[PDB]
Design an enzyme around this catalytic site. Structure first.
Site, mmCIF file in Angstrom:
data_model
loop_
_atom_site.group_PDB
_atom_site.id
_atom_site.type_symbol
_atom_site.label_atom_id
_atom_site.label_comp_id
_atom_site.label_asym_id
_atom_site.label_seq_id
_atom_site.Cartn_x
_atom_site.Cartn_y
_atom_site.Cartn_z
ATOM 1 C CE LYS B 573 3.843 -9.341 -0.827
ATOM 2 N NZ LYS B 573 4.364 -9.422 -2.210
ATOM 3 C CB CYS B 670 3.295 -17.853 -12.015
ATOM 4 S SG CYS B 670 4.318 -19.347 -11.870
ATOM 5 C CE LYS B 702 -2.401 -6.278 -9.090
ATOM 6 N NZ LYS B 702 -1.796 -6.060 -7.752
HETATM 7 C C1 FMN Z 1 6.465 -3.715 -2.455
HETATM 8 C C2 FMN Z 1 5.294 -4.190 -3.405
HETATM 9 C C3 FMN Z 1 4.804 -5.516 -3.323
HETATM 10 C C4 FMN Z 1 3.779 -5.878 -4.171
HETATM 11 N N1 FMN Z 1 3.292 -7.173 -4.074
HETATM 12 C C5 FMN Z 1 2.247 -7.593 -4.895
HETATM 13 C C6 FMN Z 1 1.806 -8.962 -4.684
HETATM 14 O O1 FMN Z 1 2.227 -9.802 -3.882
HETATM 15 N N2 FMN Z 1 0.751 -9.327 -5.530
HETATM 16 C C7 FMN Z 1 0.133 -8.516 -6.502
HETATM 17 O O2 FMN Z 1 -0.779 -8.917 -7.188
HETATM 18 N N3 FMN Z 1 0.639 -7.244 -6.603
HETATM 19 C C8 FMN Z 1 1.660 -6.702 -5.865
HETATM 20 N N4 FMN Z 1 2.129 -5.403 -5.989
HETATM 21 C C9 FMN Z 1 1.521 -4.584 -6.927
HETATM 22 C C10 FMN Z 1 0.331 -3.826 -6.263
HETATM 23 O O3 FMN Z 1 -0.740 -4.588 -5.736
HETATM 24 C C11 FMN Z 1 -0.227 -2.661 -7.098
HETATM 25 O O4 FMN Z 1 -0.875 -3.398 -8.155
HETATM 26 C C12 FMN Z 1 0.928 -1.687 -7.585
HETATM 27 O O5 FMN Z 1 1.886 -1.243 -6.643
HETATM 28 C C13 FMN Z 1 0.243 -0.557 -8.354
HETATM 29 O O6 FMN Z 1 -0.474 0.279 -7.356
HETATM 30 P P1 FMN Z 1 0.083 1.601 -6.622
HETATM 31 O O7 FMN Z 1 0.386 2.540 -7.743
HETATM 32 O O8 FMN Z 1 -0.978 2.136 -5.728
HETATM 33 O O9 FMN Z 1 1.300 1.128 -5.870
HETATM 34 C C14 FMN Z 1 3.213 -4.947 -5.135
HETATM 35 C C15 FMN Z 1 3.706 -3.646 -5.201
HETATM 36 C C16 FMN Z 1 4.727 -3.261 -4.359
HETATM 37 C C17 FMN Z 1 5.243 -1.819 -4.454
#
Ligand code: FMN
EC number: 1.3.1.2
Lengths: 1005, 1005
Positions: B573, B670, B702
């Site tokens: 995370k 950020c 990212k």
């Molecule tokens: C509950 C939640 C928390 C997330 N936390 C982060 C995070 O801390 N850092 C980050 O770079 N992306 C975070 N994301 C984004 C994901 O890493 C991913 O890029 C995003 O959900 C798109 O992928 P998916 O379609 O498989 O969910 C988060 C997404 C969700 C749903």
């Protein structure tokens, strides 16, 4: 220090049932499996020969009843077919496509309005219609493995929600005032019998404007068989009362204790008294009898369905009578004779009276059963035994009680004739016998009261099948008494059919003519009077819904039909100067893959690589002139596009303005040079708007693209340029997908090429909603036309609340057709209306607060069940049934409807715009002190463990999943992330509540 | 000029059936409705007492058969439950959750592999399992109105696709070479009877490594009852052959014409010959007989099920026997005695032989029927008549032929006890009598051949219920012969159970021990050998799937379990320095509204307002050290975030690198052209420069999709020194508002919210565009994809788009970590299939769609094609008549080899970026190679959606027949492709090259 990346004993334990792929095949003996199977059993056990006790249990047993969760799923599944076969197969011609579409869009009011418009007993019918032999029998989805749609259940659901809204029916708003009505409408009208047929007839006559309608009912109760015989466990009496009160809202009078019979009410006395028309809807009052049962009494144990069913009804239907009577004491083995609905209802009802065993005896074979499979299933699931090829011959009585019935075998010969074999007999022991052969009309005094109308071969009133008119022009008849059909819906239709010709007859008697084409009025309520007009940028919209510049506006002829349907406004497909003529490629519009391999209705998105209109500016400008000439109150906005050239934008905008367009919409998709499109550069947008502003006087809106870092900067640029508002937003740039071989879709030409397209539909709604909200907050009061996933009145209201004044639609029409406008308008009116009803503040729009349920049926509030941790399966289910049965026995020993009135002004569209903005803000404005935790309602849980799995592999391992009951329990380690609630299949089973215990974020170290 | 905005007569005509809301209630008489109903009838007519002609008709009659369209819908519906009750209720303990999940993800290979791993007769069982009394009986969805999942049909579908792939089974890859196997595995093993039990036992023994296994079968055919008695219309013989061949792939030998009998093969002769172990699976060879039928011959019209069913099977199952055999000539009335599967199959089979009428006679009542409801339904729908409470007494034989059967009535008393009433008889006329009381083992010669094993009271071989071992340690038994159960799956399980203990016994005889915990091997094929590893940025990934930085990586303990499950890599995370500590709010993660009110599995998106990890950098760094120490081959990427400060980024990156992370991922969310650093190329370039000079390990930036030009940001990262980019983070949005205007998520008493990030399949089009555009602009630059990846298929789309690895979040939130197994087997299958020349017409694992109705192949009869005969009303009747005639015509007219790869199986590196060649500008698309829609009328379900979409969203180019409800695309089609996109039937509509002259509609010249 500890191994941080490892679960401690406690967590490992809580994760005990978490899924983990096995590396080997499992080993479980066949014996072990047989022993374990019973623990998880959900459905009936084929090896069980006795069904739970049902004495005094009148709980709903219909398999078709639906709760909101289930209704939404089924409604979304419906193909919403053109020239629908289900409607053609419905005796009242209900527009099933439309009402189910409304349910799928959460517009239960609109659905109910559509249902009641064609069927005044819409709720009763949804519950009792033998759909497999009617509407459902013609459903196109029967051609799919999943099967036909549960039309009845959907009708029942929408009607039940409407009933809960407690909204009264009103006189047609387009009818002249009651005092301005022609004398003919004051003609005294009489109807005999207060059953489905007369209730329907009286209702439609009232809709037409007749002010003196009286139904004379023989009994002290009303509703006919719906009340006196259909079981409470199939049709609750409160449903009947609800429909009768709706009819009474129209002024129809009902007088009980009045019978059509010699010496009482007769056609002659009615004529003498000045009645101008009469409708006979007395049904078939008497039981079809058999000589062998002559002299047998109830004390001996003999009943006809006409004796038995009303006794059970009076005892189980609170409100039916003023009497508090006991349930018939049926002890021992019961023999029910018959193979129709009457027989099966007697069988199931006998069980409620305490019968130990029930035998349904048929003269013919099982194949010859007349009741539909769904009715038969109710008796069969309750373990009633069926005995075919049987004909009664004698009844044995001893000690003043029936003890047996002797029968003779029956056969079908090489002719089709049914014969009885005298040498082959059966001596069946029984304590109670109920004849359910059917009903007839025999009373000589009743027949005499109908003099001098002609009776047919079957000794029933003869009527013209089209007009329902008897041999006497002022007398009509319908329902069971005509002897053509035996269903509630067909009886309702008979009354409906008769109402038009009674109307025609009465008008003629007063020297007035009627339209050659039947014009029965629709069903109306105060909700229909709600004003949904809105003003924006000096323009008046009759309703906030309009067609976006897209495929639905490919041709002006389509816009014409859309206005005819009721759409408030429409955009022309984007057009340009002749020099910018384009040619589309194909394929170019594909379904979205945004919600998986789900085909048919409700695609969650579409992707298109379509260009501007292939039709000329000349065509569009002339079209606009034509449309505005014929639809002066419908707003027509011309969508135009030019390259980044001042002279072009001024020329085209002026051409569009000269055609009579109410406003212009500037498509900013043209490339240039921040991106590639003009709409992605604030500078270009500002200049384009400036050029147009100095060229025309009418309002114009800049259509923004969501494909930008800061859409507010673009909106602001448009405003600074002179735009009167903005349309947010156009499609989202994307690639919908690739086939397994790497080729795209759409694929163009032999090269199977493609280019980035625009994504539309519900999949982009979050993007459009954010765009609308961000612009509304940054530029308060600046008109916004919303576009992006609007597919219902509910979603439309979300955009209005977000700051938009009007709502553009494309994908929802591509998924359906122009008629959705009817749903959007009735839906919006309902949403606004409900905001004025204080008693319904707990509802979310048209959705009642979710009550604890299982399969849509309310969970019993028995003290002996709540908190017993008894899931609905295996031994636990057996325990629940025992507790419920005991409760019913306990209830046994121990022996009004007002409409809600608005208590505040009904909000206008202008009053709700932007109301949601007050809740939006920065993350810092959110409280991190007011935390929540998840709470599960065990009574609503279906034991899938999804909450558990989500918390385990995507959360905080805070849920305990019981290994025996499969019931989840949220523990104190919950952080309120809300993922469990988000994945739960049961709406509102899980709820987030304010945390009461100390909260402290998990820091790891 | 003409009125341009109006439809000309021609178009008005074509729009005749287009939906239009009515302004009045409809008028249709009840008689008119009764007459019109028959025209649209889809389902059985309850008033029809005569069954359609079925002579020589062995077409599939199972109600559970599914086609791909139907299978995908049902698989998506399954809740994919934890500790699933369906699996607990399956005798072979199939991991239903997993195989159905694979089907929903279009990974049919993975589903089949899972099925066959626990059940070697997976296809047979999918078709014949009495699921209502097994797996389905425990399904949690029974608690919903829509009901339980069609588990058998899903199992059948996945297994059928696998069968079509023609992939052989292989020896377990982890087993030592055949020559290095201990001597014990060469032990001679014998099995008696080639039925489900022995086939299963032999299969598992072969999996364990035994190389000398021989099944001795009495008959000339193999498969047991699956072959000799279960009807071809329920279980096609090719299914049996398929499963037999899979077993033979493991070396199992089958010798027919060999019987276990005193004068032939006996336990003593086997022992004498050196056999070390024997499994008895001969079932119950003889019919249960009744004394009253003694002497009756087939010529007289008498058959036992053991005589009859094999006769029908031999004539209807091509491949079963060497020579052709005729269908038994059954004429007249047929009496079938029995109430189990045997009786019902005899009844339905009798109809195929020409029976005029069939009577199923039961000794007890209907309630006591032994066959499951689904089996009973087949006979009932074919109009078989059922006669309960009947016991045969005499077979009237006159003129050398049965003319009738005399029975006595039966009844039940106080303690159940079944009595027969002699004075109450029945003389039922009949020409044929088939006894179907069941089967037994009576042959003295066979019993003696089993000397000296102990037999129980039931005169059957006695075995330990857990080990399946008889009184003789080297002899085991299972299946019907044990007399515990009577199902294919339980027999398969008996053989499975026995295999482990036979293994234990044999090993012990050779002085070797075995694990205390049973370890039966899984099912393997060459697909499992496919290499799915990939190298990116100098890092080696064992597979391309990994967990994105998100809720599934909330804790390092979760990553540990993910690696244990098989995930190739994982992101922590996002974490930061202590000074940037944060505190999450709640609620913060909600379900998407992107695909309507569909709850439970497969949410199309999620929205979150979650912040970075609440756990410290110390926790994460120590965790990374731990994870890399225990999983050195699994890639761990540390996600970090700092404010726009050089010292901070260098400090945190160095700390993460020091922990042992394989790489870093820079979260650019950020706030420092938007408000985030990731939205400004300048800031991104600098941040990457700072990190680049701080660490030596690879790092990826990212990217956020919330930018005008994501390529500019990717390029900035590359210029800054990044080793690649992760595309993309979540999409900014607002998921929705309640009807009262409040948002969701709603935080605190103020019910506030802020813009959140949308994830899931709803954003896949955005992520796909991002990956492809970056891949095209920066060739070779590593891309880690994220955004809606939820299957091997979708993952492959991203690989084809230019990504090297695939990050997942939402798919896990919707399920759990085990999806990794599905993704890996799915990707292996997709790559493997690319090497199979004979399957080039497939789209991935999907076979080319064949013309069908309800998943069943449409008959290719000359007098059907182009007859315009839809599947309803009078047309359906015609179709049935034509089909029946074809079956009679066919009556008048009396090897499986594995596909071998013909090209190298592609490695991941070989597929990356392969789709880019098809992407380009709009100008690169051909506007000359146009297409038009073509509809396959045989697949159409007559909904009219194509018609409605073309009418209100297209070019009014489709004619919808008013009588047949069949659509026809006319020459005015422009190939926009909307109709194909809304059609509920996969591939019913296809786009084909236009052959007629094409000219764009310009409106005006
Ligand atoms: C509950 C939640 C928390 C997330 N936390 C982060 C995070 O801390 N850092 C980050 O770079 N992306 C975070 N994301 C984004 C994901 O890493 C991913 O890029 C995003 O959900 C798109 O992928 P998916 O379609 O498989 O969910 C988060 C997404 C969700 C749903």
């Amino acid at each position: 220090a500890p191994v941080l990346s490892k679960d401690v004993a406690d967590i490992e334990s809580i994760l005990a049932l978490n899924p983990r792929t096995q590396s080997h095949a499992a080993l479980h003996s066949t014996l072990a499996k047989k022993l374990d199977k019973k623990h998880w059993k959900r459905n009936p056990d084929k090896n069980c020969f006795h069904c739970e006790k049902l004495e005094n249990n009148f709980d709903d047993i219909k398999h078709t009843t639906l709760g909101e969760r289930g209704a939404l799923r089924e409604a979304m599944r419906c193909l919403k077919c053109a020239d629908a076969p289900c409607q053609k197969s419905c005796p009242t011609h209900l527009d099933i496509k439309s009402f189910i579409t409304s349910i799928s869009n959460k517009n239960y009011y609109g659905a109910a309005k559509m249902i009641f418009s064609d069927n005044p007993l819409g709720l009763t019918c949804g519950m009792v219609c033998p759909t497999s032999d009617l509407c459902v029998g013609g459903c196109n989805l029967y051609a799919t493995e999943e099967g036909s749609i549960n039309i009845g259940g959907l009708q029942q659901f929408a009607s039940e929600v409407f009933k809960a809204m407690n909204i009264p029916q009103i006189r047609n708003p387009c009818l002249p005032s009651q005092e301005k009505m022609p004398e003919a409408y004051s003609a005294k009208i009489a109807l005999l019998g207060a059953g489905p047929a007369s209730i329907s007839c009286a209702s439609f006559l009232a809709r037409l404007g007749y002010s003196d309608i009286t139904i004379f009912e023989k009994q002290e109760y009303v509703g006919g068989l719906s009340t006196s015989e259909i079981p409470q466990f199939r049709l609750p009496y409160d449903v009947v009362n609800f429909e009768i009160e709706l009819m009474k809202d129209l002024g129809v009078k009902i007088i009980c204790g009045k019978s059509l019979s010699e010496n009482e009410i007769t056609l002659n006395t009615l004529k003498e008294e000045g009645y101008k028309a009469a409708f006979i809807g007395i049904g078939l009052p008497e039981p079809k009898t058999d000589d062998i049962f002559q002299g047998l009494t109830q004390d001996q144990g003999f009943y006809t369905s006409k004796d038995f069913l009303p006794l059970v009804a009076k005892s189980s239907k609170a409100g039916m009578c003023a009497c508090h009577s006991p349930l018939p004491s049926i002890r021992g083995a019961v023999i029910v004779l018959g193979a129709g609905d009457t027989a099966f209802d007697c069988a199931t009802s006998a069980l409620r009276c305490g019968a130990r065993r029930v035998f349904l005896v048929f003269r013919k074979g099982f194949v010859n059963i007349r009741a539909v499979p769904e009715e038969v299933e109710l008796a069969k699931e309750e373990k009633c035994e069926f005995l075919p090829f049987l004909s009664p011959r004698k009844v044995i009585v001893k000690g003043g009680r029936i003890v047996a019935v002797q029968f003779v075998r029956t056969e079908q010969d090489e002719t089709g004739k049914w014969n009885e074999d005298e040498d082959q007999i059966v001596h069946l022991k029984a304590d109670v016998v109920i004849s359910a052969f059917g009903s007839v009309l025999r009373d000589p005094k009743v027949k005499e009261a109908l003099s001098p109308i002609k009776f047919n071969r079957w000794d029933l009133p003869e009527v013209d099948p089209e007009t329902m008119q008897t041999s006497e022009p002022w007398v009509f008849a319908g329902g069971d008494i005509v002897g053509m059909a035996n269903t509630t819906v067909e009886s309702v239709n008979d009354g409906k059919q008769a109402s038009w010709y009674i109307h025609k007859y009465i008008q003629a008697q007063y020297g007035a003519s009627v339209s050659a084409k039947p014009e029965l009025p629709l069903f109306y309520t105060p909700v229909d009077l709600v004003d949904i007009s809105v003003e924006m940028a000096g323009l008046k919209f009759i309703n906030p819904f309009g067609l976006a510049s897209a495929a639905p506006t490919t041709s002006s002829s389509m816009i014409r039909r859309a206005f005819e349907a009721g759409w408030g406004f429409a955009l022309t497909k984007t057009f340009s100067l002749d020099k910018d003529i384009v040619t589309n490629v194909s394929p170019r519009i594909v379904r979205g893959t945004t919600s998986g391999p789900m085909y048919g209705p409700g695609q969650s998105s579409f992707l298109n690589i379509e260009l501007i209109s292939e039709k000329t500016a000349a065509y569009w400008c002339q079209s606009v002139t034509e449309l505005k000439a014929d639809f002066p109150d419908n707003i027509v906005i011309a969508s135009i596009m030019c390259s980044y050239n001042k002279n072009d934008w001024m020329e085209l905008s002026r051409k569009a303005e000269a055609s009579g367009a109410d406003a212009l919409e500037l498509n900013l998709s043209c490339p240039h040079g921040m991106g590639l499109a003009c709409g992605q550069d604030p500078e270009l947008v500002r200049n384009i708007c400036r050029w147009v502003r100095q060229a025309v006087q009418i309002p114009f809106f800049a259509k923004l693209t969501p494909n930008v870092t800061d859409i507010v900067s673009i909106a602001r640029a448009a405003k600074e340029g002179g735009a009167d508002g903005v349309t947010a937003t156009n499609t989202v740039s994307g690639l919908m997908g690739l086939k397994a071989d790497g080729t795209p879709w759409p694929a163009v030409g032999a090269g199977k090429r493609t280019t980035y397209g625009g994504v539309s539909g519900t999949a982009i709604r979050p993007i459009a909603l954010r765009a609308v909200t961000t612009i509304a907050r940054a530029l308060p009061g600046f008109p916004i036309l919303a576009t992006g996933g609007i597919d219902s009145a509910e979603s439309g209201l979300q955009f209005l609340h977000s700051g938009a004044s009007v709502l553009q639609v494309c994908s929802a029409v591509q998924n359906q057709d122009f008629t959705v406008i009817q749903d959007y308008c009735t839906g919006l009116k309902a949403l606004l209306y409900l905001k004025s009803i204080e008693e319904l503040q707990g509802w979310d729009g048209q959705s009642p607060g979710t009550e604890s349920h299982q399969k849509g049926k309310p969970v019993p509030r028995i003290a002996e069940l709540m908190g017993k941790k008894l899931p609905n399966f295996g031994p636990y289910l057996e325990q629940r049934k025992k507790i419920i049965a005991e409760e019913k026995m306990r209830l046994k020993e121990q022996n009004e409807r007002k409409p809600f009135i608005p208590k505040k002004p009904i909000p206008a569209i202008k009053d709700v715009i932007g109301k949601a903005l007050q809740y939006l803000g920065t993350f810092g404005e959110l409280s991190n002190i007011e935390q929540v935790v998840a709470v599960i309602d065990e009574e609503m849980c279906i034991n899938c463990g999804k909450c558990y799995m989500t918390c385990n592999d995507s959360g905080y391992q805070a849920i305990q999943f019981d290994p025996e009951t499969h019931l989840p329990t949220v523990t104190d380690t919950c952080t309120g992330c809300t993922l469990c609630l988000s994945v739960c299949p049961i709406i509102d089973c899980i709820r987030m509540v304010s945390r009461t215990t100390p909260y402290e974020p998990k820091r790891g170290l």
